[PDB]
Design a protein around this nucleic acid. Structure first.
Ligand code: MG
Ligand code: MG
Ligand code: MG
Ligand code: MG
Ligand code: MN
Ligand code: MN
Ligand code: MN
Ligand code: MN
Lengths: 458, 458
DNA sequence: GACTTGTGTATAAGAGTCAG
DNA sequence: CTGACTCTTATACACAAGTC
DNA sequence: GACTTGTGTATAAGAGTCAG
DNA sequence: CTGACTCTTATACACAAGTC
C-alpha cells in the first residue's frame, strides 16, 4: 500500500504515464504528490513556497505535449494492477458534469440551457470496488466530452457512453473482466447495452426504468415479478434528513424503518431475444405520505434463493459510492474551484484531481476496520503523537491502541462528535483529522531532530 | 498585548461583560477563545472534541438571558481601555449587511427587494485606529437593525445612524473624544451630521457627495475649491486588477500611476451657518478612457499647507480598513456561514465573531514592522520551530531572526509567494501561516514533553 | 433562605449542504 | 437518484453556583 | 548529431474573488 | 466605494536532458 505517504502514492499511481518524455512523467508524479499532500488546496499552497515547484506545476498543467487522456490512462493502469488481488469486483459506472462559469466557460460545452452561463464537461466514469469488503480500488475509466449547443452537431448519441465504457473496461481488464460486475443506474436501461454485455458474457446489475415486457409471460417485468413467490425480504433504516425542493420549500424527512419484499425470476426481452434475471424489491405497508421504496433490477447474477437475490440488492446499494466520489472530486479535491484559462489546461489539472479524489475516499476506508493494532497502518511516531493528542478522549468501547481507536482518534482530530451517534465519520472529517496529524507530525519530528543533534529546545 | 494567546486575548476583550451572572461571562470568554483559536471554523471543531465545551457553547448562543448588546459593549470597553495609549485616533465608520437565506431569514429584515430570499441585518460600525501608525485598535460601536419591508413601518430614518454612532462614541470615549477623528464615506454627507459634530467640537473627515454651496463665495464647493491655488499634489499607484460588471462582462484594469492636484480652503454652509474646511484632490491629465480620481473631503482638520491637506488625504485613505474588517468578519470569521435558527441566537454568535474578525486583522499587523527581533512577538519555542520550518527559504533582504523575517516565514507557511511582488501578504495568508505554526507547535511541544519524562520518541 | 440558572454528562433529532 | 453526513437545538439528572 | 524540450531562476501581469 | 490581494499564464537565460 502506497497511500498514506503522498509521494509514494503518486508514484504508484502515475509512474507509468506515457507522456513522450520521461521528464513530464516525473513531473506528473511530483505534481500529484504535492496536490495529494495538500488535498483540496491550491497549486501554490501545495508548493510549500518553492518557486521551482510552483513554476513546474503550472508549466505542466499547460503543457500542450501532455495528454490528459494519457494521465487518466496511467492511473487506470494502476487500478488494473491492484485489481489482480481480488476474485470479484464491482465496476460502478456513472456520469457527472464539471461546471464552470469563468471566462473559459465559453469554450466549454453545454450543461443546461443554451443560454446558461455555467458550462463545462460531462464525464462518464467507472469506479472499481472489491466485491468482498467493498473497498475502493480506483478509477478504471473516464470519458470526457462537451455537449454541443445543437444536438445536430453531436458526433454521436450520448447513450453510447455505457458501451464505450464497457469496451474500455474489457480491454484494460483482459482476463480479469470475468470477475467484474458492472453497476449502473436506470439511465443504463438500454437494450443495446444489455445485449452487448450479454454477448461478451459480461456481468452486470442495472436498475430498470422502462416498462419492458417479459416475452415468456408476456406481462410487464414489474407484473411478471409480482407474480413470483416472495423469497422473504429485508429492512432498511431510512435516516432523518432535511429536504429542500426545486422551489426552496423546506421540510423534514424524519427517520424510519422500511420493510421490503423480495421476489426474483428469469425474464426474456424481444431485443435479440435475450435472457437474463431480475429482482424486485418493494416496500410493504408504506407510510401514509411517503414515496414507496421500489427497485426493479436487471442482472446477469443468480437470483434463485433469498441469499442470491439479496446479494444483488447489496451490490446495487454500493452504486452510491460513485456519488461520494463525485463529491470527493468536487468539494474534496477542488475540481470546480480551478480557474485555468484554457480548456486543455483545466482538463489536465482536473484529471489529476480525479485521482486525489479517490484517495480521499480510500484514506477513510483505510482507517475502517472490517482488534487489529493501529500499528498496522500508522508509524510508531504517528502512533505516539496520536496517543499524546488523544489523551483522555478515548471511549471505553475503543480498545486501546487498536485500528478502531486510531480511526476515532483521527476523526476526533478532525472535529468528529458523532452527532447522530452512528459512529461513522465523514471522509471529510477523517481527512481533516489526518491532515492535522500530519501537520503536528512535522513539529514532533522537528523536535526529535533537534534533540538528535544535542540542541536544546525552546 | 493579549493577542497571540487566544485565551488571554478572549479574557482581555470580554472579561467585563455585564451579563447578569458571572457564569455567563466566564463562558463567553471561553467561547470566544475557542472560536479565536479556531478562527473561521465551526463551534464543534472549536470544541476539540469536548462534549461539555460543545454543549456549553451552544447553550450560550441561545441563552435568552444573554444580551448581544452587552457582549458587543464589553468588547467595546476594551477598545476604550486600549485607546488611552494613543494621542490621536481615527474612528472609521461604515455600514454593512449580514445576509442569510436559511429558514431564519424570514424572521430577519429586508436587504434588497421585498421578495428577495436573502434577508438579515444592517450593521453600522465604528472601527478605531491609532492615528500614528494606523494600527487597528478595535471596535468601538455597533448598531444592528432590521429594515422593515415597508418604510412606513420604520422606527426612524436610517440616516440617523451617524449621529447615534457619535453619541455612543462620545459617551464611551469621554475625555478621549478630543483625540478622535471620525472617518466616513459620502453617505455621511448630511448637514445635520456635520452640525452635530461641530456643535460638540468633534473632529471628522467626511467625503462630499452633494452639490453644496459655499456661502461666502456663493459657488459650489467644487468650484470654489478649483479657484484655490494649487498646494502641490500627489501620486498614486493604481494596481492591476480584473473587473466584472453587474452584467458579468469581464475586462482588465491595467496598473497605472495617477497624478493628483491638491487644493484646500475654508467653506461655509447655510445650515446653521457652519464653517469648516475642505480639500479637493483631482486627477490631472487623466487617461483617455478611465473615470478620473476625485475626492472632495469635508473636515474639521487644518488644511492650509500642503502637509496639512495631505494629512487629510492620508486619513481618508485609511477608511478602507473598515472594508477589510467587513471581509474579515464574513469570509474570515464566518459571519454568514452560521446557521442558527433564531434571530437572537445568530445575533449572539455573530456578535462574538465581530471581535474574532478584528483579531484576524491585528494578527497581521502584529507581524508588520513599522530590525526588531522576532523574539519580541514570538516565544523561543515558536522561534525555534519557525526557524526549523523556514530552513532555506529566507531571502537575503530579510535579516536573519528579525521581525521582518518572522513575518515572511509565517506568510510563507501560509503559502505566500508574493505574486505581484508587493511584499505584502494578505491577512488571510498570515492567518493561514500562524495557524500552521501553532499546529506544528503542538507536535513540537508534545515531543518536548515526552523527552522531559524520559520517554523515547517513535 | 427561597428560588433560578449553569455544568457535565447523557439522549435524540430537526435544519442545512452537496452529491445526486 | 432508494444519501451521508454535520450543524444546531432540545430533553433529562445531580449537582454547583448563581440571583434577589 | 541535430534539434527540441524541461528546469531553476528570474520578471511581469492578466483573471478572478469578495469587500465594497 | 478612489481595493487588496491570490491564482494563473507568460517572458527570458544558461543549462540539462530529452527526441528522432
Ligand atoms: Mg478469467
Ligand atoms: Mg484542513
Ligand atoms: Mg481631552
Ligand atoms: Mg487553514
Ligand atoms: Mn446517473
Ligand atoms: Mn458606506
Ligand atoms: Mn449520479
Ligand atoms: Mn462599505
Amino acid at each position: 500500500s502506497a497511500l498514506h505517504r503522498a509521494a509514494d502514492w503518486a508514484k504508484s499511481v502515475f509512474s507509468s504515464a506515457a507522456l513522450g518524455d520521461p521528464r513530464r512523467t516525473a513531473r506528473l508524479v511530483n505534481v500529484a504528490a504535492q496536490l495529494a499532500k495538500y488535498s483540496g488546496k491550491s497549486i501554490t499552497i501545495s508548493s510549500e513556497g518553492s518557486k521551482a515547484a510552483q513554476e513546474g506545476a503550472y508549466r505542466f498543467i499547460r503543457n500542450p505535449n501532455v495528454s490528459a487522456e494519457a494521465i487518466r490512462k496511467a492511473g487506470a493502469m494502476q487500478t488494473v494492477k491492484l485489481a489482480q488481488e481480488f476474485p470479484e469486483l464491482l465496476a460502478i459506472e456513472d456520469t457527472t458534469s464539471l461546471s464552470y462559469r469563468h471566462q473559459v466557460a465559453e469554450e466549454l460545452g453545454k450543461l443546461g440551457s443554451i443560454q446558461k452561463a455555467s458550462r463545462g464537461w460531462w464525464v462518464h466514469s467507472v469506479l472499481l470496488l472489491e466485491a468482498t469488503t467493498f473497498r475502493t480500488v480506483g478509477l478504471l475509466h473516464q470519458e470526457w466530452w462537451m455537449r454541443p449547443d445543437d444536438p445536430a452537431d453531436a458526433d454521436e448519441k450520448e447513450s453510447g457512453k455505457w458501451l464505450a465504457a464497457a469496451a474500455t473496461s474489457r480491454l484494460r481488464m483482459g482476463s480479469m473482466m470475468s470477475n467484474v460486475i458492472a453497476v449502473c443506474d436506470r439511465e443504463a436501461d438500454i437494450h443495446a447495452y444489455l445485449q452487448d454485455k450479454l454477448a461478451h458474457n459480461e456481468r452486470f446489475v442495472v436498475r430498470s426504468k422502462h416498462p419492458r415486457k417479459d416475452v415468456e409471460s408476456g406481462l410487464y417485468l414489474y407484473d411478471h415479478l409480482k407474480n413470483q413467490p416472495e423469497l422473504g425480504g429485508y429492512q432498511i433504516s431510512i435516516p432523518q434528513k432535511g429536504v429542500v425542493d426545486k422551489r426552496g420549500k423546506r421540510k423534514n424527512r424524519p427517520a424510519r424503518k422500511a420493510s421490503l419484499s423480495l421476489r426474483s425470476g428469469r425474464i426474456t426481452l424481444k431485443q435479440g431475444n435475450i435472457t437474463l434475471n431480475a429482482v424486485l424489491a418493494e416496500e410493504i405497508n408504506p407510510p401514509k405520505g411517503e414515496t414507496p421504496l421500489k427497485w426493479l433490477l436487471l442482472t446477469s447474477e443468480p437470483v434463485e434463493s433469498l441469499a442470491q437475490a439479496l446479494r444483488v440488492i447489496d451490490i446495487y446499494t454500493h452504486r452510491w459510492r460513485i456519488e461520494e466520489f463525485h463529491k470527493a472530486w468536487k468539494t474534496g479535491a477542488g475540481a470546480e474551484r480551478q480557474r485555468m484559462e484554457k480548456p486543455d489546461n483545466l482538463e489536465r489539472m482536473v484529471s489529476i484531481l480525479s485521482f486525489v479524489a479517490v484517495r480521499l475516499l480510500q484514506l477513510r476506508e483505510s482507517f475502517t476496520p472490517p482488534s487489529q493494532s493501529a500499528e498496522t497502518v500508522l508509524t510508531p511516531d504517528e502512533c505516539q503523537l496520536l496517543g499524546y493528542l488523544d489523551k483522555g478522549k478515548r471511549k471505553r468501547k475503543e480498545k486501546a491502541g487498536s485500528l478502531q481507536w486510531a480511526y476515532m482518534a483521527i476523526a476526533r482530530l478532525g472535529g468528529f462528535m458523532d452527532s447522530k451517534r452512528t459512529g461513522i465519520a465523514s471522509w471529510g472529517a477523517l481527512w481533516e483529522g489526518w491532515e492535522a496529524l500530519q501537520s503536528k507530525l512535522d513539529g514532533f519530528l522537528a523536535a526529535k531532530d533537534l534533540m538528535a543533534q544535542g540542541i536544546k529546545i525552546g
